[PDB]
Amino acid sequence: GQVDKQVSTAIENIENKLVASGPGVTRYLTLPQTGWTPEQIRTELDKLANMEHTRWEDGRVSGAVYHGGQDLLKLQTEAFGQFGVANPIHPDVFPGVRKMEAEVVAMVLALFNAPSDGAGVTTSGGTESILMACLAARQKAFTERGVKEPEIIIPDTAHAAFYKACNYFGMKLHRVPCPAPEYKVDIAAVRRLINPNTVLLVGSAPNFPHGIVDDIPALSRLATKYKIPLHVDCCLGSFVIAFLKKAGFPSPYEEEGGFDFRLPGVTSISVDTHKYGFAPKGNSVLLYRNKTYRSYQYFIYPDWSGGVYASPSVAGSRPGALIAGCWASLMSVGETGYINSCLEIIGAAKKFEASIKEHPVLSKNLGIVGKPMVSVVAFQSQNGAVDIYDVADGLSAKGWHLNALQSPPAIHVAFTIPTAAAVEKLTTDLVETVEKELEKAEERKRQGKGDTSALYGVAGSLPDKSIVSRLAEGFLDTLYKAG
Amino acid sequence: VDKQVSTAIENIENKLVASGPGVTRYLTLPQTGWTPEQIRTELDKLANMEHTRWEDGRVSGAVYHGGQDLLKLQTEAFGQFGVANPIHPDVFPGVRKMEAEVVAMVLALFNAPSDGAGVTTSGGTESILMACLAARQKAFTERGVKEPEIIIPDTAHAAFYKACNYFGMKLHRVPCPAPEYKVDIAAVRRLINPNTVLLVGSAPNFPHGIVDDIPALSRLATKYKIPLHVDCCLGSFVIAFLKKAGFPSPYEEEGGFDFRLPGVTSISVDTHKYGFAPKGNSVLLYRNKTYRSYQYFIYPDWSGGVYASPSVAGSRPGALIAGCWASLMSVGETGYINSCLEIIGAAKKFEASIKEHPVLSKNLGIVGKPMVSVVAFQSQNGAVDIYDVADGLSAKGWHLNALQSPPAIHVAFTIPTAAAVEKLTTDLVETVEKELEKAEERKRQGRGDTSALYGVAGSLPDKSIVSRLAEGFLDTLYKAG
C-alpha cells in the first residue's frame, strides 16, 4: 500500500510538473473538423514556442542545445524546406539527398582518420548507432565464429544504449568497473572476462557521466590480440574531441596513436553530428574500419512478395530533409568554425574545472571526478556537510538544468556554445549554492542536527529498483498524456 | 557469377552515383565555412539534379501530398522547433504537448478505447519493431515464454522479419492464396501454439493493397488470448476516412479492422504516408497503457542516472514532431476526407480502366479485390511479361513497384499520382500494345530485360545472388568517392 501511495503521489507530482494545464491550455484531442489557416497554425505554434521552460537560450541547460545560433538554424530550416519530401530509400527520386548523405559520412570518416576501405552509415542518433554497432558485431561473430550465445564487455560508465542493445538482440552484457581516481575501465578486468563468446569490446571517448576517455590504446591491444572488434562510443566527443589537437588542447593518447581508427584494434566508432557537429537532431554517423564490417548491420530480405527489401540501418523510411540539414550544417561551419567552437567550449570547461579546484570555497567542499579532457566536467562533494544532490536542487532552484549522477554521487556539466557563455554565472551561482548548504549545516549543528534529489540519493540507495522503475514508467507515460 | 554480379553492381553505381564534369565531391570539411548564399546555391543545384519526376505524379507512393503550402508550414514548424528534443519535456514542453496531442488524435481515428495509449515512432518499421518487442516482452513477463513465435501473412511487411531477426523470434509465414490474396485463417489457427506471442494482420498490405480478415484474426486472438497487431502503416488516414468519403469500409459490418475488434491489441499507422506529415513521423497504438509499457526501456542503475526511453531512440527531433502536428491541424477532417475522395477515386478509376479497357482487360488482371490506395495488376497473357511492362513504363519515366509473388506491378496512389492516373492509363495501354507487337515478331520468327533479371534472379534456386545484388545497392548509397 504505502509504497504504492508514495509512488502514485510522486507520479502525480511529475504529471503536475510536466503536463501544462491551466486557463489557456486548449487540448486538441481530436482532428479539427475544418483545416486551420496558415496564420492560425503559425499563431498557435508561436504560442507553443513561448511556453515557460528552462531557458536554454540563457545558457542554463547542460548538453541539450549545442549551438542554437539563429543564422545556422535558418539555414537548416531552408534545407529542410528544400528537402522536406526527400526519402533516401529512393535515391533515383532524391539523388541530391543520397549524395549529401554519402558526403556527410565521408567527411566524418576523415575526421577520425579512417582507413581507405573505411565505410559508414548515417543513423537517427547515437542510440541507433550503438545498436547497429552491437548488431553488426553479433552478426559478425555468428557468421564467422558461429557464436550463438553472444557477449559484450562494456565499462560501467558506458551508455545505457548498450544495455538496450543487449536487451534487444539477446546478448550477454559485462560491465567492468571504472575505479577512482582514474574512473577509467579496468583493463585487467576486461582481459579476464574475454572468452570465445566475446563479440565486442567497448570504449568511451569520452563517457557521458564523467567525460572521461577510456584506455582506448589498451583496449585496442586486447582487441588486436584476441581478434575481437573494438567499438568506440564517441557520440559525445563528436567533433569537439577531434578538433582538440587543432585547437591546441591536448588530444587523448596522441602519443599512443589517439583513440580512433589510427588504433588497429578500433573497428567501429559512433559519432553524433547532432551533438557538436551542430547538425539538426536526428543526425548521427556510425563508422566501420571496412565495408566488410558495415555489411553485417544491413537487413536484406529477398523473398518478400513486395520485392527484395534492403535497409542499411533500423529505419526503412528516413528524413532526407534532416540529412541535408546535417550536410549543410557541416559545410557552413567548416574546419575553422569547429576549431573556434572547440576553443570556446573546451576553454569554458577548463575554466570551470579550474574554478572548482581553485576557488577558496569550492576547492574545499567539492572535487572533480577523474581528469576530464573534453567538454564534460563532473564534480562531487568532498564535504559530508554538503550533499551534492542538495547542491543540484539548489542550482535547479536557480534555473539550472545540470546532470545528476549516481556512481559516484556527482553533478556534471556538458558544455555547449550557450553554456560556455554562462560558465562565470554558473560558477557564481555554484559558489552561492555551496555557501548556503554550509550555513544549513551550521544551522543544523547549532540546532544540534527535507533532502530533495533523494530520488537519486535516498531512492538511489533504496534496496530495490522497482521504485525508480515505476517512477520512470510514470515519467514516460506522462510524456504521452494529453487527456 | 562473380563477374556478372560485379558488372550488375557497376551498373547500379553507374546508375545512382552522379559523376561527370561539374560533379564536385566534398569528401572533407571545407577549411573555411561557406556563406549562406553559397550553401543556398549548392542546395538549389542538388535540388535540381535530374530525377524521377514525382512532381509530375510519376512515382508510386513516395510523395503523398507534396503541396507547397503545406511544405512551407512544415518548414516554419521546423524553423521554430529546430532545437527541440522531447526527451527534455521540461525544456521543450510545447513539443511534448504536440506529441501527446498527435497520439491522441490518431488514437481517436482508430476508435481506440478510453485506456488506449500510443507512441510516436520515426516510421512504420520502428512501429512494427516496437509492437513485436512489446508482444515478446509481454509473453516473457506474463507467460514466461522464452522461445517466442509470431504468425504473419506472406504479404506482411519485411519489417516483421527484421523484428524477428533483431529480437530473436521465430517467424511463421501463412499463405495468402488467390483469388483472395488474404491470409489463410485455418493455416493461422493450425500454427497457434503456447509459444505464439503475436498474430499479425494487414490493413492494407503493401504488395497487393489487400486488407486481411481482421475480424477472423480477432476471433482467434480473443479465443487463444494472443495479441493481434494490425499493420495499418499504409492505410494510414486514407483507410480511416474511406467510409466518410463514401467509399466502402473494410468489414464495416463485422466491426471494422481497428480497436472496435476486441482482439486488436496494437495498430501501426504512418502519419507520414496519408497523414501527410513530414518523413520521420509514425504512430504506434496500443489498446491499453499496460500494453504500451512493455516496449519501454528503463535502466535505473546507470552511473549517469536512471535512463528511460519509450521507443528505440533516446534523442528525437521535436522539429519533425511539430511538423507532423501542424500537418494534422492544417489538413483537418475535411482535408483528409477530400484527399481520400481524390486518391481512392483515382485508384478505383485505374482499377476500372484495367478491367474494362479493350486492350488491358484482355492482357492484364487485378490482384485480388483492392479497396484502398494500392492497385496491383499482373499479366494474364503469356505474351506479355509484366516485368517487361514495368521496364516499358520505366522507360516512359514511371517509378512503379514491381512485385514477386505473384509477378505483378502495383501503384500506391498519392495526391500527385492521382492527378496522373489518366496519363498512367494511356502509357500503360501503349506499353502493353508494344509488347504484344514484339511477341508477334517473336512468333513470326521463333532478350534479357532488367526487371526480367529481377524476376530470373528471384526465380533462381538460391537468393544469395539477389542478396549480394542488394548489398551492392546499399553500399552504393554511401559511396561518395
Author numbering:
A (entry chain A): 85 to 533, 540 to 573
B (entry chain B): 87 to 532, 539 to 573
Give the authors' words.
Deacylation of Cer to sphingosine and subsequent phosphorylation by sphingosine kinase lead to the formation of sphingosine-1-phosphate (S1P), whose irreversible degradation by S1P lyase (SPL) terminates sphingolipid metabolism. SPL (EC 4.1.2.27) is a pyridoxal 5′-phosphate (PLP)-dependent enzyme bound to the endoplasmic reticulum membrane through an N-terminal sequence, with the catalytic domain facing the cytosol. The protein is a tight dimer and belongs to the Fold Type I family. The active site is formed by residues from both subunits and comprises an Y-shaped channel whose distal part is largely hydrophobic.
